[PDB]
Design a binder for this molecule. Structure first.
Ligand SMILES: NC(=O)c1ccc[n+]([C@@H]2O[C@H](COP(=O)([O-])OP(=O)(O)OC[C@H]3O[C@@H](n4cnc5c(N)ncnc54)[C@H](OP(=O)(O)O)[C@@H]3O)[C@@H](O)[C@H]2O)c1
Ligand SMILES: O=C(O)COc1cc(F)ccc1C(=O)NCc1cccc(C(=O)O)c1
Length: 316
């Protein structure tokens, strides 16, 4: 299938990218270098991941080496929750640009719909452990994102972890200038997201699937938890196709017209995970994988469940 999907800003986005959350700073430069060498052209980043400087070293070295041209790369980052105030958005974007050593981002996302009190701490807490919210709402943060397009800092803007009513709020914003291009959400066979995906796709918003392998390195994992990579039913589909379980888990969202961003710092897995353009899952395979949904989430924080904009109380 085609390697890129057309966004509603007129640009094309590679359907496979490299994730960087949890990639150690002493390993991520080589991970990104290897990824670019083996064909990746989309890197998913964020300020909160604390490794954008090291990602940037890799990007700059591959541009200097002329392995790739800047126009061939698709670099994504995200505005952290403590920067939702309109007066902080530009500086947050500029810090990311400085660290990544770029003069524009291809896509900049509101990382979560929940704004937090500005300051040095990424999760500012009250004395009882609740996150301290900001009063800035999503619509004003969206207007600040639109300014970044008009200043040339970013080519596209979007959202992440927004539920369908929050997407709808953006789409219904008085005076909306640019629609979200992307909603980046958790999606895999245990959290298949049919309802939210259909809503976003019906509005022309491209969905990116995060944690497609079930994030086995997430810091809050428990030994009892479900494991996609070890599920014998998924292993059987992979064996039938002479592919790895990870390759099936990556191809699955691709065939739903999603973008997918598996993370690895292991050179052999970075290369393996890209070898997903040479086989097809059948419709029956796809429906079987969808049947494994259990509404299980890698990403959600008990500390934010009382925030007015917490996204996961709604069904979708
Ligand atoms: N927008 C958001 O709120 C949000 C939230 C979560 C994630 N994300 C993005 O999505 C990316 C991907 O999600 P994720 O990092 O949570 O997890 P993931 O991509 O589902 O899983 C990553 C884990 O799988 C392992 N792995 C990778 N390829 C493998 C293979 N072929 N065989 C076996 N194990 C393999 C990695 O190990 P090694 O690295 O040791 O090889 C790592 O432990 C993130 O890095 C981030 O960029 C965004
Ligand atoms: O967020 C990602 O991309 C990956 O997870 C992280 C990565 C980090 F470097 C540091 C913290 C996290 C994290 O705890 N996220 C979950 C999160 C964040 C903000 C609000 C909510 C909420 O439930 O409202 C949930």
């Amino acid at each position: 299938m085609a390697s890129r999907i057309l966004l509603n800003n007129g640009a094309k986005m590679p359907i496979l990218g490299l994730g960087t959350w949890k990639s150690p700073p002493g390993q991520v430069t080589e991970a990104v270098k290897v990824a670019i060498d083996v064909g990746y052209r989309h890197i998913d980043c964020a300020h909160v991941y604390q490794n954008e400087n090291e990602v940037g070293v890799a990007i700059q070295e591959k541009l200097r080496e002329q392995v790739v041209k800047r126009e061939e790369l698709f670099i994504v980052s995200k505005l952290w929750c403590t920067y939702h105030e309109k007066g902080l958005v530009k500086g947050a974007c500029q810090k990311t640009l400085s660290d990544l050593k770029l003069d524009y981002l291809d896509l900049y996302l509101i990382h979560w719909p929940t704004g937090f009190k500005p300051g040095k701490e990424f999760f500012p807490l009250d004395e009882s452990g609740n996150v301290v919210p900001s009063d800035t709402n999503i619509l004003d943060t969206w207007a600040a994102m639109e300014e970044l397009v008009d200043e040339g800092l970013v080519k596209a803007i979007g959202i992440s972890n927004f539920n369908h009513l929050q997407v709808e709020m953006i789409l219904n914003k008085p005076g909306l200038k640019y629609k979200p291009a992307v909603n980046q959400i958790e999606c895999h066979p245990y959290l298949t997201q049919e309802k939210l995906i259909q809503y976003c796709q019906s509005k022309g918003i491209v969905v990116t699937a995060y944690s497609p392998l079930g994030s086995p390195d997430r810091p809050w994992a428990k030994p009892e938890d479900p494991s996609l990579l070890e599920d014998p039913r998924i292993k059987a589909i992979a064996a039938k196709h002479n592919k790895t379980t990870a390759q099936v888990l990556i191809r699955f969202p691709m065939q739903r017209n999603l973008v997918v961003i598996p993370k690895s710092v292991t050179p052999e897995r970075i290369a393996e995970n890209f070898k997903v353009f040479d086989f097809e899952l059948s419709s029956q395979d796809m429906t079987t994988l969808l049947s494994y949904n259990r509404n299980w989430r890698v990403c959600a924080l008990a500390s934010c469940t009382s925030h007015k904009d917490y996204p996961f109380h709604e069904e979708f």
